[PDB]
Amino acid sequence: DSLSKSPENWMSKLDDGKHLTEINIPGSHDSGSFTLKDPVKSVWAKTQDKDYLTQMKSGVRFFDIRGRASADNMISVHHGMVYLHHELGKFLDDAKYYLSAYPNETIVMSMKKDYDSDSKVTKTFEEIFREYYYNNPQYQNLFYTGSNANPTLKETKGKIVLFNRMGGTYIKSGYGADTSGIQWADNATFETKINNGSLNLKVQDEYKDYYDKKVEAVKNLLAKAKTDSNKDNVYVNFLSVASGGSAFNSTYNYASHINPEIAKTIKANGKARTGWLIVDYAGYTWPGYDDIVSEIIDSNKLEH
């Protein structure tokens, strides 16, 4: 069958000699926002209703973690100023649990500073993630720590690869893991070289677009990924969009229109390269529409 039909372990069915970059990977934008209940606040701050484990079960492999330093030893999951009711440890344990049960999957975890540190913090966000997470013995063996600039599914399987959005880091494994980090253009389609120029990161993160212009931005990067068999090029394509203050154009409303559309587009294109598509409300299905996660998963060509 399709890999779609077994989302809990689609990556085991792949040829693990593939570089993560050439794999078509579903990701979830602001992964930990599933905790929000508040109806008013969720319009704009909630982007997921499935928890970590359920996300991973539905086939999400890219996780968008944005945090705030709560204390010199602690990172809280945040959507900008909105606290998501847990620390990073929690994502790490769910992730460890899931990888232990499906040791042929890799998880790519993005890590970003999304709001000012608690007044008590005296360390930087990068130092705290590095010392109290990445180098913590608690999470020994959880992270990829190899020195390959462009790691393969075999080298990373059963692990978290850091996708570094902290800025320059002293961490040495993962995407953008150098003292230069990743140069991120605001609300843009852009391209930048990462990992001492080893990789070419091409991102569409135009998070303030309206429906029509977003679909277009997404499809434009989509059409590029499709004709590009360079394993040194990494595509990150965010389907997600900001809502703003009061309006009842929630992130969910935008998602219910963008997801099916991009999904129908991927299906039509068959088995062509998509890059990593980061989506809101991963796994939320609408009767009579194509599912974006499932469509992403199924675009992977099985050859070996």
Side-chain angles (χ1 to χ4, degrees), residues 155-215:
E155 299 165 282
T156 56
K157 228 158 54 159
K159 278 157 237 152
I160 308 187
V161 191
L162 176 67
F163 182 88
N164 174 37
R165 288 186 67 188
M166 292 178 299
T169 191
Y170 296 123
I171 294 159
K172 287 211 205 310
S173 322
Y175 303 99
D178 51 39
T179 50
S180 223
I182 304 183
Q183 308 188 50
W184 201 277
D186 187 13
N187 194 48
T189 282
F190 58 94
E191 187 186 2
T192 193
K193 313 263 258 167
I194 60 176
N195 302 227
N196 200 21
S198 270
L199 297 183
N200 200 353
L201 178 56
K202 310 175 180 268
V203 176
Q204 173 283 290
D205 185 26
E206 305 184 1
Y207 60 93
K208 298 187 203 137
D209 292 7
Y210 190 67
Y211 311 46
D212 51 343
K213 289 312 187 165
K214 186 66 147 167
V215 157

Tab-separated table of all heavy atoms in Angstrom, residues 155-215:
chain	number	residue	atom	x	y	z
A	155	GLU	N	22.189	7.467	9.303
A	155	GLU	CA	22.947	8.116	10.387
A	155	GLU	C	22.072	8.748	11.456
A	155	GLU	O	22.572	9.033	12.523
A	155	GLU	CB	23.827	9.260	9.875
A	155	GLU	CG	24.875	8.888	8.898
A	155	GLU	CD	25.448	10.103	8.190
A	155	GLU	OE1	24.822	10.644	7.264
A	155	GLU	OE2	26.561	10.516	8.526
A	156	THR	N	20.808	9.060	11.153
A	156	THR	CA	19.959	9.877	12.049
A	156	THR	C	18.729	9.163	12.621
A	156	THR	O	18.146	9.612	13.627
A	156	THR	CB	19.475	11.142	11.313
A	156	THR	OG1	18.773	10.770	10.101
A	156	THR	CG2	20.681	12.035	10.968
A	157	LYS	N	18.293	8.118	11.914
A	157	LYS	CA	17.268	7.149	12.351
A	157	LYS	C	17.343	6.960	13.879
A	157	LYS	O	18.434	6.739	14.411
A	157	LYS	CB	17.679	5.831	11.730
A	157	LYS	CG	16.665	5.101	11.062
A	157	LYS	CD	17.271	4.145	10.079
A	157	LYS	CE	18.307	3.197	10.645
A	157	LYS	NZ	18.422	2.018	9.714
A	158	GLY	N	16.212	7.034	14.583
A	158	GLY	CA	16.186	6.799	16.020
A	158	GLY	C	16.696	7.970	16.831
A	158	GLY	O	16.926	7.830	18.046
A	159	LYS	N	16.871	9.129	16.171
A	159	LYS	CA	17.501	10.343	16.796
A	159	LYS	C	16.794	11.691	16.457
A	159	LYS	O	15.930	11.779	15.556
A	159	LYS	CB	19.021	10.399	16.469
A	159	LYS	CG	19.935	9.518	17.397
A	159	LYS	CD	21.237	9.167	16.717
A	159	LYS	CE	21.496	7.646	16.621
A	159	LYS	NZ	22.358	7.219	15.438
A	160	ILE	N	17.143	12.735	17.205
A	160	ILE	CA	16.722	14.061	16.835
A	160	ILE	C	17.897	14.790	16.228
A	160	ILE	O	18.956	14.897	16.854
A	160	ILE	CB	16.217	14.904	18.039
A	160	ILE	CG1	15.138	14.148	18.844
A	160	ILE	CG2	15.628	16.209	17.537
A	160	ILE	CD1	14.488	14.975	19.909
A	161	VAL	N	17.684	15.300	15.016
A	161	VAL	CA	18.619	16.202	14.355
A	161	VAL	C	18.152	17.578	14.706
A	161	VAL	O	16.971	17.891	14.532
A	161	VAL	CB	18.595	16.062	12.828
A	161	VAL	CG1	19.767	16.812	12.243
A	161	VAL	CG2	18.679	14.596	12.403
A	162	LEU	N	19.063	18.388	15.230
A	162	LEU	CA	18.764	19.784	15.510
A	162	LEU	C	18.679	20.593	14.194
A	162	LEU	O	19.539	20.467	13.310
A	162	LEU	CB	19.848	20.404	16.431
A	162	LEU	CG	19.763	21.907	16.765
A	162	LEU	CD1	18.513	22.221	17.640
A	162	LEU	CD2	21.082	22.441	17.447
A	163	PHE	N	17.640	21.422	14.092
A	163	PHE	CA	17.510	22.352	12.992
A	163	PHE	C	17.629	23.700	13.682
A	163	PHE	O	16.694	24.095	14.397
A	163	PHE	CB	16.160	22.190	12.268
A	163	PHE	CG	16.025	23.092	11.108
A	163	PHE	CD1	16.469	22.706	9.870
A	163	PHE	CD2	15.548	24.399	11.271
A	163	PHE	CE1	16.384	23.578	8.757
A	163	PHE	CE2	15.477	25.295	10.160
A	163	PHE	CZ	15.896	24.854	8.901
A	164	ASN	N	18.762	24.390	13.508
A	164	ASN	CA	19.157	25.422	14.449
A	164	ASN	C	18.667	26.806	14.092
A	164	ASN	O	19.198	27.391	13.142
A	164	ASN	CB	20.659	25.539	14.570
A	164	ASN	CG	21.067	26.739	15.451
A	164	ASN	OD1	20.399	27.029	16.425
A	164	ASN	ND2	22.119	27.446	15.078
A	165	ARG	N	17.707	27.336	14.853
A	165	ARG	CA	17.211	28.679	14.639
A	165	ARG	C	17.477	29.562	15.843
A	165	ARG	O	16.712	30.511	16.114
A	165	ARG	CB	15.734	28.666	14.287
A	165	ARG	CG	15.513	28.114	12.858
A	165	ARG	CD	14.102	28.249	12.480
A	165	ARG	NE	13.755	29.655	12.355
A	165	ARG	CZ	12.510	30.101	12.177
A	165	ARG	NH1	11.482	29.233	12.101
A	165	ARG	NH2	12.300	31.411	12.045
A	166	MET	N	18.573	29.250	16.546
A	166	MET	CA	19.000	30.046	17.680
A	166	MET	C	19.923	31.193	17.317
A	166	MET	O	20.172	32.035	18.135
A	166	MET	CB	19.681	29.158	18.725
A	166	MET	CG	18.651	28.217	19.343
A	166	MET	SD	19.239	27.061	20.537
A	166	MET	CE	20.408	26.116	19.556
A	167	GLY	N	20.445	31.198	16.092
A	167	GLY	CA	21.599	32.031	15.755
A	167	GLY	C	22.874	31.177	15.757
A	167	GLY	O	22.797	29.950	15.734
A	168	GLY	N	24.044	31.825	15.803
A	168	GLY	CA	25.310	31.151	16.001
A	168	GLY	C	25.197	30.261	17.205
A	168	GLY	O	24.591	30.647	18.245
A	169	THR	N	25.771	29.063	17.078
A	169	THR	CA	25.812	28.152	18.201
A	169	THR	C	27.190	27.520	18.311
A	169	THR	O	27.922	27.392	17.300
A	169	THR	CB	24.683	27.046	18.088
A	169	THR	OG1	24.563	26.305	19.319
A	169	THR	CG2	24.926	26.101	16.906
A	170	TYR	N	27.533	27.075	19.521
A	170	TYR	CA	28.701	26.229	19.683
A	170	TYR	C	28.390	24.760	19.483
A	170	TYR	O	29.316	23.939	19.487
A	170	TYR	CB	29.393	26.477	21.015
A	170	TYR	CG	29.922	27.891	21.077
A	170	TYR	CD1	29.537	28.769	22.098
A	170	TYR	CD2	30.800	28.365	20.090
A	170	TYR	CE1	30.002	30.072	22.135
A	170	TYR	CE2	31.279	29.678	20.124
A	170	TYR	CZ	30.882	30.522	21.152
A	170	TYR	OH	31.368	31.826	21.156
A	171	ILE	N	27.111	24.427	19.298
A	171	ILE	CA	26.729	23.056	18.891
A	171	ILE	C	27.284	22.716	17.504
A	171	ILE	O	27.351	23.579	16.633
A	171	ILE	CB	25.207	22.802	18.966
A	171	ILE	CG1	24.764	22.865	20.434
A	171	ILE	CG2	24.840	21.452	18.335
A	171	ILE	CD1	23.288	23.133	20.656
A	172	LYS	N	27.708	21.462	17.315
A	172	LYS	CA	28.421	21.109	16.087
A	172	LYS	C	27.769	20.089	15.146
A	172	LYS	O	28.406	19.687	14.189
A	172	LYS	CB	29.865	20.700	16.420
A	172	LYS	CG	30.769	21.872	16.803
A	172	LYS	CD	32.191	21.593	16.388
A	172	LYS	CE	33.234	22.348	17.224
A	172	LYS	NZ	32.862	23.800	17.295
A	173	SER	N	26.527	19.670	15.412
A	173	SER	CA	25.825	18.699	14.568
A	173	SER	C	24.414	19.194	14.374
A	173	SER	O	23.758	19.603	15.336
A	173	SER	CB	25.681	17.368	15.293
A	173	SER	OG	26.821	17.063	16.055
A	174	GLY	N	23.906	19.087	13.158
A	174	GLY	CA	22.574	19.556	12.887
A	174	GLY	C	22.596	20.646	11.844
A	174	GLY	O	23.644	21.134	11.467
A	175	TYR	N	21.430	21.064	11.388
A	175	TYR	CA	21.396	22.068	10.353
A	175	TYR	C	21.594	23.468	10.932
A	175	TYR	O	20.937	23.847	11.877
A	175	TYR	CB	20.108	21.949	9.580
A	175	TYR	CG	19.898	20.584	8.984
A	175	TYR	CD1	19.070	19.649	9.615
A	175	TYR	CD2	20.500	20.228	7.761
A	175	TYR	CE1	18.834	18.392	9.047
A	175	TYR	CE2	20.272	18.965	7.187
A	175	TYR	CZ	19.457	18.051	7.846
A	175	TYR	OH	19.194	16.806	7.282
A	176	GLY	N	22.535	24.215	10.364
A	176	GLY	CA	22.889	25.528	10.867
A	176	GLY	C	23.628	25.447	12.185
A	176	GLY	O	23.629	26.400	12.952
A	177	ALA	N	24.250	24.303	12.472
A	177	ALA	CA	24.960	24.185	13.749
A	177	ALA	C	26.405	24.588	13.536
A	177	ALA	O	27.260	23.720	13.360
A	177	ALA	CB	24.845	22.784	14.340
A	178	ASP	N	26.619	25.914	13.448
A	178	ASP	CA	27.933	26.574	13.522
A	178	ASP	C	27.752	27.917	14.165
A	178	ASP	O	26.675	28.235	14.638
A	178	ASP	CB	28.623	26.705	12.158
A	178	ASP	CG	27.731	27.316	11.118
A	178	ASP	OD1	26.980	28.256	11.460
A	178	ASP	OD2	27.771	26.846	9.962
A	179	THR	N	28.809	28.702	14.223
A	179	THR	CA	28.787	29.895	15.029
A	179	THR	C	28.186	30.975	14.161
A	179	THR	O	28.066	32.116	14.549
A	179	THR	CB	30.185	30.276	15.412
A	179	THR	OG1	31.015	30.300	14.227
A	179	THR	CG2	30.730	29.255	16.430
A	180	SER	N	27.776	30.576	12.968
A	180	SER	CA	27.075	31.446	12.081
A	180	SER	C	25.573	31.214	12.074
A	180	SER	O	24.812	32.124	11.790
A	180	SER	CB	27.610	31.257	10.684
A	180	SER	OG	27.731	32.536	10.147
A	181	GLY	N	25.155	29.984	12.355
A	181	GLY	CA	23.741	29.666	12.433
A	181	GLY	C	23.050	29.894	11.110
A	181	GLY	O	23.668	29.795	10.086
A	182	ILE	N	21.747	30.154	11.121
A	182	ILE	CA	20.984	30.280	9.867
A	182	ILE	C	20.506	31.705	9.733
A	182	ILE	O	19.802	32.171	10.618
A	182	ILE	CB	19.718	29.348	9.831
A	182	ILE	CG1	20.076	27.882	10.060
A	182	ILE	CG2	18.964	29.487	8.509
A	182	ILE	CD1	18.878	26.933	9.949
A	183	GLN	N	20.834	32.393	8.641
A	183	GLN	CA	20.281	33.753	8.455
A	183	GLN	C	18.830	33.692	7.950
A	183	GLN	O	18.567	33.234	6.834
A	183	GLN	CB	21.165	34.594	7.532
A	183	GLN	CG	22.632	34.598	7.986
A	183	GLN	CD	23.514	35.577	7.193
A	183	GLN	OE1	23.183	36.752	7.033
A	183	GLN	NE2	24.654	35.076	6.708
A	184	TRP	N	17.895	34.136	8.789
A	184	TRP	CA	16.479	33.947	8.514
A	184	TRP	C	15.781	35.244	8.066
A	184	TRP	O	15.542	36.140	8.881
A	184	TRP	CB	15.771	33.382	9.767
A	184	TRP	CG	14.481	32.695	9.417
A	184	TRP	CD1	13.264	33.287	9.215
A	184	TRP	CD2	14.288	31.286	9.164
A	184	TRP	NE1	12.332	32.344	8.901
A	184	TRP	CE2	12.917	31.106	8.872
A	184	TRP	CE3	15.139	30.156	9.185
A	184	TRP	CZ2	12.360	29.841	8.585
A	184	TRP	CZ3	14.577	28.897	8.914
A	184	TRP	CH2	13.202	28.758	8.622
A	185	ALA	N	15.428	35.361	6.799
A	185	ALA	CA	14.715	36.572	6.372
A	185	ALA	C	13.261	36.585	6.900
A	185	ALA	O	12.552	35.549	6.883
A	185	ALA	CB	14.787	36.746	4.837
A	186	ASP	N	12.826	37.749	7.368
A	186	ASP	CA	11.470	37.913	7.954
A	186	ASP	C	10.357	37.883	6.895
A	186	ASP	O	10.369	38.690	5.966
A	186	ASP	CB	11.421	39.235	8.739
A	186	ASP	CG	10.129	39.427	9.514
A	186	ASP	OD1	9.310	38.508	9.703
A	186	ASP	OD2	9.926	40.555	9.965
A	187	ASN	N	9.401	36.966	7.020
A	187	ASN	CA	8.223	36.973	6.154
A	187	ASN	C	8.643	36.961	4.673
A	187	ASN	O	8.202	37.768	3.868
A	187	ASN	CB	7.361	38.213	6.473
A	187	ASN	CG	5.950	38.145	5.870
A	187	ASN	OD1	5.274	37.146	5.998
A	187	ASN	ND2	5.502	39.235	5.241
A	188	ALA	N	9.547	36.069	4.313
A	188	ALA	CA	10.081	36.046	2.937
A	188	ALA	C	10.193	34.640	2.390
A	188	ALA	O	10.127	33.670	3.143
A	188	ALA	CB	11.432	36.722	2.900
A	189	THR	N	10.297	34.550	1.064
A	189	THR	CA	10.868	33.419	0.373
A	189	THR	C	12.351	33.785	0.286
A	189	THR	O	12.704	34.870	-0.183
A	189	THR	CB	10.222	33.247	-1.028
A	189	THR	OG1	8.939	32.631	-0.868
A	189	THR	CG2	11.053	32.358	-1.926
A	190	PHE	N	13.238	32.943	0.786
A	190	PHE	CA	14.656	33.266	0.679
A	190	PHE	C	15.506	32.023	0.541
A	190	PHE	O	15.018	30.891	0.628
A	190	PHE	CB	15.130	34.054	1.898
A	190	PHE	CG	14.921	33.333	3.229
A	190	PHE	CD1	15.911	32.580	3.776
A	190	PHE	CD2	13.720	33.427	3.909
A	190	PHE	CE1	15.712	31.942	4.957
A	190	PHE	CE2	13.529	32.807	5.124
A	190	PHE	CZ	14.508	32.062	5.651
A	191	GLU	N	16.797	32.261	0.383
A	191	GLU	CA	17.768	31.219	0.170
A	191	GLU	C	19.047	31.673	0.859
A	191	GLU	O	19.464	32.823	0.752
A	191	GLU	CB	17.996	31.092	-1.316
A	191	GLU	CG	18.856	29.955	-1.768
A	191	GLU	CD	19.127	30.045	-3.284
A	191	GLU	OE1	18.659	31.007	-3.910
A	191	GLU	OE2	19.814	29.176	-3.855
A	192	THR	N	19.665	30.766	1.590
A	192	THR	CA	20.887	31.114	2.301
A	192	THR	C	21.703	29.843	2.430
A	192	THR	O	21.123	28.747	2.513
A	192	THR	CB	20.563	31.737	3.679
A	192	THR	OG1	21.728	32.350	4.223
A	192	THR	CG2	19.969	30.707	4.663
A	193	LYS	N	23.023	29.988	2.418
A	193	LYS	CA	23.919	28.870	2.615
A	193	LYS	C	24.150	28.587	4.100
A	193	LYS	O	24.415	29.498	4.889
A	193	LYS	CB	25.236	29.144	1.914
A	193	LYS	CG	25.043	29.638	0.512
A	193	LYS	CD	25.157	28.542	-0.523
A	193	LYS	CE	26.544	28.590	-1.243
A	193	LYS	NZ	26.770	27.338	-2.030
A	194	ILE	N	24.031	27.315	4.479
A	194	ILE	CA	24.252	26.885	5.879
A	194	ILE	C	25.338	25.803	5.942
A	194	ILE	O	25.726	25.218	4.895
A	194	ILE	CB	22.960	26.380	6.547
A	194	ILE	CG1	22.376	25.183	5.800
A	194	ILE	CG2	21.923	27.465	6.577
A	194	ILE	CD1	21.135	24.589	6.487
A	195	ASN	N	25.803	25.549	7.169
A	195	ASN	CA	26.849	24.582	7.486
A	195	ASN	C	28.164	24.817	6.740
A	195	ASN	O	28.524	24.072	5.837
A	195	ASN	CB	26.363	23.138	7.315
A	195	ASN	CG	25.137	22.809	8.172
A	195	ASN	OD1	25.090	21.784	8.835
A	195	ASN	ND2	24.121	23.641	8.097
A	196	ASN	N	28.888	25.852	7.148
A	196	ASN	CA	30.081	26.304	6.434
A	196	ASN	C	29.936	26.192	4.885
A	196	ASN	O	30.849	25.734	4.158
A	196	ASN	CB	31.344	25.615	6.994
A	196	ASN	CG	32.651	26.384	6.647
A	196	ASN	OD1	32.637	27.594	6.339
A	196	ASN	ND2	33.796	25.662	6.700
A	197	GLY	N	28.769	26.615	4.404
A	197	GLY	CA	28.450	26.625	2.987
A	197	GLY	C	28.220	25.270	2.386
A	197	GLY	O	28.186	25.155	1.176
A	198	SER	N	28.054	24.234	3.199
A	198	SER	CA	27.790	22.878	2.686
A	198	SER	C	26.407	22.730	2.048
A	198	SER	O	26.234	21.929	1.132
A	198	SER	CB	27.844	21.867	3.828
A	198	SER	OG	29.131	21.357	3.998
A	199	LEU	N	25.413	23.444	2.593
A	199	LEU	CA	24.010	23.297	2.163
A	199	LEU	C	23.406	24.594	1.693
A	199	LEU	O	23.772	25.662	2.164
A	199	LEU	CB	23.136	22.762	3.303
A	199	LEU	CG	23.472	21.361	3.826
A	199	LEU	CD1	22.467	20.959	4.886
A	199	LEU	CD2	23.476	20.365	2.679
A	200	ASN	N	22.439	24.482	0.804
A	200	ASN	CA	21.700	25.634	0.333
A	200	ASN	C	20.255	25.566	0.813
A	200	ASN	O	19.422	24.821	0.283
A	200	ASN	CB	21.797	25.801	-1.210
A	200	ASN	CG	21.466	27.236	-1.662
A	200	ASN	OD1	21.045	28.074	-0.858
A	200	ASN	ND2	21.662	27.525	-2.947
A	201	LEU	N	19.976	26.360	1.839
A	201	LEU	CA	18.661	26.387	2.472
A	201	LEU	C	17.787	27.343	1.703
A	201	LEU	O	18.150	28.498	1.556
A	201	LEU	CB	18.783	26.837	3.926
A	201	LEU	CG	17.508	26.971	4.770
A	201	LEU	CD1	16.645	25.670	4.834
A	201	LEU	CD2	17.895	27.437	6.145
A	202	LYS	N	16.671	26.836	1.196
A	202	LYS	CA	15.671	27.608	0.463
A	202	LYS	C	14.359	27.552	1.216
A	202	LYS	O	13.752	26.499	1.324
A	202	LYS	CB	15.459	27.017	-0.939
A	202	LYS	CG	16.743	26.796	-1.689
A	202	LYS	CD	16.498	26.102	-2.989
A	202	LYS	CE	17.806	25.891	-3.711
A	202	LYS	NZ	18.094	27.026	-4.641
A	203	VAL	N	13.918	28.689	1.736
A	203	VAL	CA	12.782	28.728	2.649
A	203	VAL	C	11.723	29.659	2.087
A	203	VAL	O	12.045	30.706	1.511
A	203	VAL	CB	13.224	29.319	3.981
A	203	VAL	CG1	12.046	29.465	4.942
A	203	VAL	CG2	14.335	28.479	4.602
A	204	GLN	N	10.457	29.276	2.245
A	204	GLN	CA	9.315	30.184	2.034
A	204	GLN	C	8.640	30.259	3.361
A	204	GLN	O	7.969	29.303	3.737
A	204	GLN	CB	8.329	29.600	1.001
A	204	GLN	CG	6.983	30.357	0.795
A	204	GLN	CD	5.987	30.106	1.897
A	204	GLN	OE1	5.445	28.996	2.030
A	204	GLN	NE2	5.754	31.117	2.719
A	205	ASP	N	8.843	31.362	4.075
A	205	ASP	CA	8.252	31.571	5.401
A	205	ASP	C	7.460	32.892	5.434
A	205	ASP	O	7.635	33.738	6.329
A	205	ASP	CB	9.362	31.558	6.507
A	205	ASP	CG	8.795	31.658	7.932
A	205	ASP	OD1	7.628	31.247	8.137
A	205	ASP	OD2	9.518	32.152	8.851
A	206	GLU	N	6.585	33.077	4.463
A	206	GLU	CA	5.887	34.331	4.327
A	206	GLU	C	4.673	34.218	5.193
A	206	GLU	O	3.572	34.009	4.690
A	206	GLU	CB	5.476	34.582	2.865
A	206	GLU	CG	6.622	34.516	1.864
A	206	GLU	CD	6.199	34.866	0.433
A	206	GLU	OE1	5.023	35.179	0.197
A	206	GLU	OE2	7.046	34.792	-0.476
A	207	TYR	N	4.865	34.386	6.498
A	207	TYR	CA	3.815	34.041	7.441
A	207	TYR	C	2.662	35.056	7.540
A	207	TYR	O	1.648	34.793	8.172
A	207	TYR	CB	4.405	33.729	8.818
A	207	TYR	CG	5.188	34.899	9.430
A	207	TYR	CD1	4.566	35.801	10.269
A	207	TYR	CD2	6.556	35.064	9.163
A	207	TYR	CE1	5.274	36.886	10.837
A	207	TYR	CE2	7.285	36.135	9.729
A	207	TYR	CZ	6.619	37.047	10.570
A	207	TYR	OH	7.301	38.101	11.135
A	208	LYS	N	2.827	36.217	6.918
A	208	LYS	CA	1.774	37.277	6.954
A	208	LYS	C	0.922	37.411	5.668
A	208	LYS	O	0.044	38.291	5.609
A	208	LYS	CB	2.378	38.636	7.286
A	208	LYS	CG	3.043	38.759	8.645
A	208	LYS	CD	3.395	40.248	8.801
A	208	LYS	CE	4.502	40.486	9.766
A	208	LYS	NZ	5.412	41.494	9.178
A	209	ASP	N	1.170	36.550	4.673
A	209	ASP	CA	0.368	36.518	3.450
A	209	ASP	C	-1.083	36.230	3.732
A	209	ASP	O	-1.385	35.681	4.782
A	209	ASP	CB	0.868	35.453	2.466
A	209	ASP	CG	2.223	35.775	1.882
A	209	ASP	OD1	2.872	36.774	2.335
A	209	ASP	OD2	2.626	35.012	0.969
A	210	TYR	N	-1.971	36.581	2.793
A	210	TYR	CA	-3.392	36.207	2.837
A	210	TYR	C	-3.511	34.907	2.005
A	210	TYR	O	-2.548	34.566	1.310
A	210	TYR	CB	-4.220	37.368	2.239
A	210	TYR	CG	-5.741	37.297	2.390
A	210	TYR	CD1	-6.331	37.401	3.645
A	210	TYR	CD2	-6.581	37.162	1.267
A	210	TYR	CE1	-7.711	37.343	3.805
A	210	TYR	CE2	-7.990	37.103	1.418
A	210	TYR	CZ	-8.533	37.181	2.696
A	210	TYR	OH	-9.875	37.182	2.927
A	211	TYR	N	-4.652	34.196	2.081
A	211	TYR	CA	-4.876	32.874	1.428
A	211	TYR	C	-4.224	32.776	0.051
A	211	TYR	O	-3.289	31.989	-0.177
A	211	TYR	CB	-6.388	32.528	1.232
A	211	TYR	CG	-7.361	32.683	2.397
A	211	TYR	CD1	-7.373	33.824	3.199
A	211	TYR	CD2	-8.303	31.682	2.674
A	211	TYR	CE1	-8.289	33.958	4.280
A	211	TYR	CE2	-9.235	31.795	3.748
A	211	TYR	CZ	-9.215	32.940	4.549
A	211	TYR	OH	-10.110	33.090	5.603
A	212	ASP	N	-4.770	33.539	-0.879
A	212	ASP	CA	-4.326	33.533	-2.259
A	212	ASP	C	-2.815	33.718	-2.468
A	212	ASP	O	-2.183	33.004	-3.274
A	212	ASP	CB	-5.122	34.571	-3.058
A	212	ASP	CG	-5.140	35.968	-2.400
A	212	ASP	OD1	-4.842	36.152	-1.188
A	212	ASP	OD2	-5.477	36.922	-3.123
A	213	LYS	N	-2.213	34.661	-1.750
A	213	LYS	CA	-0.795	34.945	-1.962
A	213	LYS	C	0.055	33.872	-1.330
A	213	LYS	O	1.127	33.553	-1.837
A	213	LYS	CB	-0.397	36.330	-1.435
A	213	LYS	CG	-0.945	37.499	-2.254
A	213	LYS	CD	-0.724	37.329	-3.780
A	213	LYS	CE	-1.142	38.609	-4.501
A	213	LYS	NZ	-0.636	38.646	-5.898
A	214	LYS	N	-0.435	33.310	-0.220
A	214	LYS	CA	0.258	32.184	0.411
A	214	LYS	C	0.294	30.932	-0.479
A	214	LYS	O	1.382	30.418	-0.761
A	214	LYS	CB	-0.340	31.858	1.765
A	214	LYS	CG	0.438	30.813	2.472
A	214	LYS	CD	1.823	31.297	2.838
A	214	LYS	CE	2.208	30.633	4.147
A	214	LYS	NZ	3.631	30.743	4.512
A	215	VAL	N	-0.881	30.471	-0.927
A	215	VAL	CA	-0.957	29.370	-1.879
A	215	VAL	C	0.078	29.599	-2.958
A	215	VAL	O	0.894	28.730	-3.225
A	215	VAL	CB	-2.386	29.186	-2.467
A	215	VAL	CG1	-2.371	28.465	-3.827
A	215	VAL	CG2	-3.232	28.418	-1.490
